[PDB]
Paper text:
Through 3D classification, we observed substantial intrinsic mobility of the receptor. The extracellular domains tilt toward or away from the membrane, with an angular range of up to 11°. To improve the resolution, we combined all particles to generate a global reconstruction at 3.1 Å resolution, then performed local refinement focused on the VFT/CRD region or the 7TM domain, obtaining final resolutions of 2.9 Å and 3.6 Å, respectively. In the unliganded (apo) state, TAS1R2 and TAS1R3 show a highly asymmetric architecture, and their extracellular domains are markedly tilted relative to the membrane plane. These features differ from other heteromeric class C GPCRs, such as GABAB receptor and heteromeric mGluRs, which adopt an orientation perpendicular to the membrane plane. The tight packing of the sweet receptor is facilitated by interactions between VFT domains and CRDs, with the VFT LB2s held together by loops extending from the CRDs.
Sugars and other sweet-tasting compounds are detected by the sweet taste receptor, a member of the class C GPCR family. The sweet receptor is a heterodimer composed of TAS1R2 and TAS1R3,3,4 two type 1 taste receptor family members that share the distinctive architecture of class C GPCRs: a large extracellular Venus flytrap (VFT) domain, responsible for ligand recognition; a cysteine-rich domain (CRD); and a seven-transmembrane (7TM) domain that mediates G protein coupling. To address this gap, here we present cryo-electron microscopy (cryo-EM) structures of the sweet receptor in the inactive, unliganded state, as well as in the activated, sucralose- and advantame-bound states. Unlike other class C GPCRs, such as mGluR, CaSR and GABAB receptors, where agonists stabilize inter-subunit VFT interactions to promote activation, the sweet receptor is activated by the rearrangement of a TAS1R2 VFT loop, which destabilizes interactions between the lower VFT lobes and the VFT–CRD interfaces.
Author numbering:
A (entry chain B): 23 to 353, 367 to 388, 393 to 835
B (entry chain A): 25 to 43, 50, 52 to 340, 358 to 371, 381 to 831
The structure:
Amino acid sequence: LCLSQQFKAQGDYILGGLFPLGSTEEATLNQRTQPNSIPCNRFSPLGLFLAMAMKMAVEEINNGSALLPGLRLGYDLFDTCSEPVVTMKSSLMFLAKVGSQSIAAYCNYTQYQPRVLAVIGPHSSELALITGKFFSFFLMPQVSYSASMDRLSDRETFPSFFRTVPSDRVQLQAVVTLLQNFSWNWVAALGSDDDYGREGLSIFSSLANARGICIAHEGLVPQHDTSGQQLGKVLDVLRQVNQSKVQVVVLFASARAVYSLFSYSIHHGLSPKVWVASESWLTSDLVMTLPNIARVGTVLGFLQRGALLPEFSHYVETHLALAADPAFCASQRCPRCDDIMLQNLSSGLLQNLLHHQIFATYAAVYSVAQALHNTLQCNVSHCHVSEHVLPWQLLENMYNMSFHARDLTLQFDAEGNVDMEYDLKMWVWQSPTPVLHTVGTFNGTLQLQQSKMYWPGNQVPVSQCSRQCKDGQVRRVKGFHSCCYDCVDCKAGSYRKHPDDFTCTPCNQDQWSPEKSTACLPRRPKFLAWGEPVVLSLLLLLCLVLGLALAALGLSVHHWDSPLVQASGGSQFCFGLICLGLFCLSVLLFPGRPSSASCLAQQPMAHLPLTGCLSTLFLQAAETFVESELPLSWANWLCSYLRGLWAWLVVLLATFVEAALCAWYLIAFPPEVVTDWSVLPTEVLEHCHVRSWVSLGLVHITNAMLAFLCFLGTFLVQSQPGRYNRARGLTFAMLAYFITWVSFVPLLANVQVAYQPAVQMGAILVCALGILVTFHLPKCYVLLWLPKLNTQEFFL
Amino acid sequence: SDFYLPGDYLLGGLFSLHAHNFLQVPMCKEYEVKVIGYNLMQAMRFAVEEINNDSSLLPGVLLGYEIVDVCYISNNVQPVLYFLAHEDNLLPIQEDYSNYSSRVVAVIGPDNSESVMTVANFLSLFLLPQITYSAISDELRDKVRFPALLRTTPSADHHIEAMVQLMLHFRWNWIIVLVSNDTYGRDNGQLLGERVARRDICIAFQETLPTLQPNQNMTSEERQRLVTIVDKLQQSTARVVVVFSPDLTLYHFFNEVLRQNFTGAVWIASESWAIDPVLHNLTELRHLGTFLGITIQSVPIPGFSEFRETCNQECDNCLNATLGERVVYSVYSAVYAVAHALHSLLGCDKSTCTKRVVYPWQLLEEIWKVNFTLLDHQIFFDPQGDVALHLEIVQWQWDRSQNPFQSVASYYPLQRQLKNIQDISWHTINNTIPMSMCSKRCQSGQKKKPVGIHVCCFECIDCLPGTFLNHTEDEYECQACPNNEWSYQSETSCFKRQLVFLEWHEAPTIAVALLAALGFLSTLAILVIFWRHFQTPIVRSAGGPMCFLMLTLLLVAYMVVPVYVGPPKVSTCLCRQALFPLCFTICISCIAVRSFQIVCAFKMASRFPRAYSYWVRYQGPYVSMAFITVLKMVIVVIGMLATGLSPTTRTDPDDPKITIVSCNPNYRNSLLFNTSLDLLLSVVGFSFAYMGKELPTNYNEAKFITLSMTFYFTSSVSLCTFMSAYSGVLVTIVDLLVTVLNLLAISLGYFGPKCYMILFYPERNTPAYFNSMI
């Protein structure tokens, strides 16, 4: 077909054009050492579509009367080959003096006469930079349809560069507004390693920092998938996103880098994330090929709302059909186009989404034509043809204007951009292929249609960060900038001493602190002080039991001449009752502030009087036993021998053994007054510490053995009626003793620590009360209410 | 003017001697003069004149040049068109330039990286060789992208490596980065980011400085911006601060830092401001900290000190404005490189030169090739286009007897490491290296616990008992102790635990064994003395096979001590947990049924003769003994199968060395279960005998049942009391002691009185005495 021949047409004024028509294979891309020409040997449909769009625009402009009446606007095109060398060699021919093959190095622009009025610019940002810097010296206006990078905005270096697409800064302002709307204050930011991604990160980070959005991590993903280094790099990026606990990610990248990242992201199993895409890859004909996409998570991104051109596909097919006729040849820039048939340019390729860039090319041609229309001061159907315009004259008319595309109006702003507007489009996964849903629009502010949003589940996802700690918390900064904190609570036993933004301070030994505390509080000392409401009952019981003891003693002294008392043990009985009264009073060593004296004294001071008392009941049990269970022929001798001085001998011997064991306890296992700062939550414990409770048996074994021997001496005995039964009283007394001190151990082992002394006091009191109630009380009861029995015959 | 000299071959030269309505393009002269441009231009002129004087380098050939005062970004393009022209002003456009001959054969290119890339893209299609002297941008290494370009300087790669190796040498682990908004700052900050994490250093934070300028007044928002940055500096624990910025902008930043009363940092200065006089002269900087700077090493040109003292090729104020050592050698070596490459291209030897027309691409092909020694330094181009020149680190000094900047290290790019570091006079109290690290190092036996994102952030936590720290294996989790070892919490190693069990060396153990032996031999004597009097009424009424087998069982039960004592074995553990209790229990059950028979059986016979008629018919007492025995069998086995046949290990309550080996680890639980039934039998027999207290039918049996069961009951209650308040080693030996004491309770308290009557009251053996009870 004759395509390549259709890339030129004469006119009174001529427009230049650079398009990605051609390309060269990878084998060509070696380092270059000799100044030969590049072998352009491939074809693309995108370049031909854009060239056809320009051809359509100029054809329409020449058909109508609304622009440039009475003049024929011409055009001819070159291919960039996506190659700077070819691009420069091509663009030089725009500037070369018309009708000749050379360019002259005049020192300023006014001396040149270029052969084109304006240049419809290249596709990619790299060539946009390269050619804009070059053209600026000649002040020839250039209108790129695709180059969105923001560095091109600078009027100082690019005074003659214009474009019909928004700059990246507007898109990223939209993205920042989106993050700001959902309060997504904590995000990761990722860009591709090429200049587009690095500049994208530079723009987005500035905007986010300015609006207080905190970037958890910022980094670049590689463009290549060839070696283990790249796999490790993407694994490290995934690690960064995972450890930072991000949920929203901004990915401003070119498509191949995103494909490389996503393919490995699917593999490595990272949880779904919210990805804010970019127009540079949200088109995603490539990305749709992945084996899984639903596990990636939600994808959102702003997409341009340029106008549609229904006529364009019919135009393309019409001209392709015309280019089959050989008659035109009776009347290269790209040789490879001639090999292409209509089946290679199917309508399915035009239905790719490319409408944005096609319409941008159309609008670019209309912008140049309208600028010339203003420059020629046209009346309706009449130009001011008195002059021939040079480009630097058109430039001054280009800035202030407004121009109309097909049913749309535009203006070049103060720095050569256009004020276009956006759709917020999101992917939903229910269909076999992902469906783009419009869910909002941006025109300088975000007009979200929030009710239509198909989140996973039915609620907004979030990642956020705490901007300020509560007063009782310790800070710790995080983020790429130190823009935000995470909070530490002061655990009990620590306090917020300073704004030391890493760790809390432990509490002092003399003090305590609760949760969330700013400062500590001293801990009070604790012990069984006098007047404690439970100890008060013991202090009453002490008086009650001592009162019983003293009442019995007084009654015995009152009736001292009567048989009952001598039969009960006479002076031994009285002495034992006095010893029991003294035993009760040992309670008073325990309460109050502990001391080194009482801590050591308390146990002997308790058990010695009790030993003295119990010896007499043991002797009465011996009397009962010798009176009932031993042969008379030496029972009488023992009975008459043990009574009297030898009873005092037994008393002294028991006291001496008890005292010796008390000394052995005071040397081998002595207790101590211990202060504990840890065993209580808000207090300091003061208590008499015992090394181990099994060591306490030294002062017990004597009394326990005496009690057991008494019980064995009394339990089996029985007596005639009409006589006093000592056995019942002694039996109940020893039984009560054993019940008391069997209860003593498990209670002492299990009461809360601070109350332990109360158990010992209570044990002593209850033991003495039992002995009194069983052995003495019935005797005094009979003495008071029925003295008639008080006789030698009844009691002896 | 001096901007041009003729010759057989010409070099282009672009130097920034200086710095719109956009149609009003300004002339380069309309901006302030910059002295470094004069220095560099005079360096090129000196090099070319010297090469013309050296008859051995270009014999019979004169080098010329055309120099243009490019104003640092603006007014590009015009110089390259001026250079590329074929004749006068004209440049032809064509497909192939392999036969072309431009006005100049090589270009000594601009300084600013933006301008270098701008010029390189235009020269590339001709492959006219360009050499540049100060553009450190790392992107210039892409010779697919910039085939025509070479450099007489190391790139930003080696500067960043100098910084990183400085940090490694002094072990700075935790740094701050500040960058300008320029491409310079952002590029170098990302490159530092790529080098740092790779080697274990961590950046605390990075932030962009505002693009202030020193002459104008500062706006309120810019003021607050600087305040906000300095606040983050003052709050952080890091103190190494790396600054990638042009020099002119930092004056405001350091004025603010001074105003904020900041101090104590180490400032590492990049190439762009490491040697700035203006910043150095800021009077009060010396209080802030230590200033270190990476810069290319100075090489003195011998003759230069004397030599220095239609448009865009003229100047009016250069010298009087003057009235750069570290870059002059780069300019000098670039010119000498072109000269040597030309000498090779002409195939020349002393006085044999043939004066070809030379095409630039061949001169490039030769410029890749030169290798020679210049001024006692050897220069050749790496395939990536860089000449290897040394870098150095300079500390700023405010003593003006010496030079303002003092060298303290040198970096060799070919050996690629920093060498012969000298004394750096720090700001600290005694010149101790100023440390900055995120965290303190672990103490012995402490694990790490990561915090946040960065590797340097971690807590230190002690290992728990049963675990230990092994630096050879890990530090982020503890290693477990072997099953026979333990650890003292925070420790680097384990220690061996010790097993404990009863053995005969111990005083209480041998004492208990001797007590059991006394019981055994007394029981055997009782048995034999009963057998010797099988005919007596005593043995007829309270003897026979029941007592014979009771005594046999009891004396074999006395053999418990060799089974309790000594290292445990499974069969002996089963024996302890079932067999000894089992054979001991039935004897107590016999005492119980005898306590029934003595009194309660008669109560049954009188009150409930039907039940008594059944009881005598179905062998009541023997069946009862068997019944309770099988109940005991169930009770023992259901505990043993729930706790295991083998011996078990338990921890000592407060001694870490000891592990206690014993049967029945759920002691208290089984203790209660086993005694519950035995002590209920004890109580029922005890109460029955108490009811028939004085019954003398069986030779006053009730009294002795009472005594024996009293001993058993009190010993059992004492054991249950003791077990509520103790948990140590003595548990099992006290268990054994109580077992032996119960064996004694039975063997002596029940049988002994009968034997005492047999031995020492023999008249009671007569049937006459027995019949007195009837």
